[PDB]
Ligand binder design. Structure first.
Ligand code: Y33
Length: 243
């Protein structure tokens, strides 16, 4: 309709190849400049933290209260040179913390868990703390959006309390009773570079609309555009109106 047109007109100023997928538990909808991106597999990059935390908590490798202490070695972002809980590292997207969690899980368990939940192509290669950053693990935007939709509903094959704890690690903001949850990603090690913004809007009436922005990134791109574009789309859709 006109909302589709308003949504499309947003992407018609973005030069990068982009797709935006929505899922309400019944219907996949696709918007953007390159719709075949929705069916194409990319590395999850930092959106893998969602499955990493779930796997770690489910298998008693971490708790949501435990402090991952900094080891004194200066990290890429200086905002990372500190101690973190998993939720704190999620919202700061502190890769070293989630690499430490992956090493605690181990390649054997990480592999069987990824096969057990059917996450992307379920490939980890031989480096348990790099597979979501450099490959070989890949996932399509439709897989991502169906993944976080099930998270929102607590219907993933994990303990209910584990799903709840990881879910609230993703909480961004609320407007009225509508809640936004989201995780961004920028995979820089692979060619082309892939940018993510995945999440879901939950309304008070139990209803969930999950979403996945997926677009090509290049060095020098605006770090805030992924979230900005996504919030604009959700506003034109009337899923998450601006205040
Ligand atoms: C996650 O996908 C990604 C990597 C490190 O796992 C992460 C956490 C980094 C970024 S932004 C990135 C850091 N500084 C870059 C830059 O522009 N330069 C040149 C310094 C951009 C993100 C993100 O999603 O924004 N995720």
């Amino acid at each position: 309709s006109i909302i589709d047109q308003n949504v499309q007109a947003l992407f018609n100023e973005i030069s990068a190849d982009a797709v935006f997928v929505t899922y309400d538990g019944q219907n996949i909808k696709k918007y953007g400049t390159h719709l075949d991106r929705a069916k194409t597999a990319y590395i999850p990059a930092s959106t893998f933290k969602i499955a990493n935390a779930l796997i770690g908590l489910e298998n008693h490798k971490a708790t949501s209260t435990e402090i991952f202490k900094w080891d004194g070695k200066p990290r890429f972002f200086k905002a990372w040179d500190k101690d973190f809980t998993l939720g704190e590292a999620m919202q700061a997207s502190t890769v070293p913390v989630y690499q430490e969690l992956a090493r605690r899980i181990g390649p054997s368990l990480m592999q069987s868990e990824l096969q057990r939940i059917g996450y992307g192509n379920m490939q980890i290669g031989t480096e348990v703390d790099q597979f979501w950053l450099k490959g070989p693990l890949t996932i399509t935007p439709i897989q991502e959006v169906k993944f976080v939709y099930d998270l929102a509903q607590g219907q993933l094959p994990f303990k209910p309390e584990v799903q709840q704890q990881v879910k609230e690690m993703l909480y961004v903001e609320r407007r009225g009773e509508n809640r936004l949850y989201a995780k961004s990603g920028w995979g820089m090690a692979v060619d082309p570079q892939v940018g993510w913004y995945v999440g879901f809007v939950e309304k008070a009436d139990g209803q969930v609309v999950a979403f996945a922005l997926n677009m090509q990134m290049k060095a020098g791109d605006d770090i805030a555009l992924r979230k900005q574009l996504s919030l604009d789309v959700l506003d034109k859709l009337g899923v998450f109106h601006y205040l």
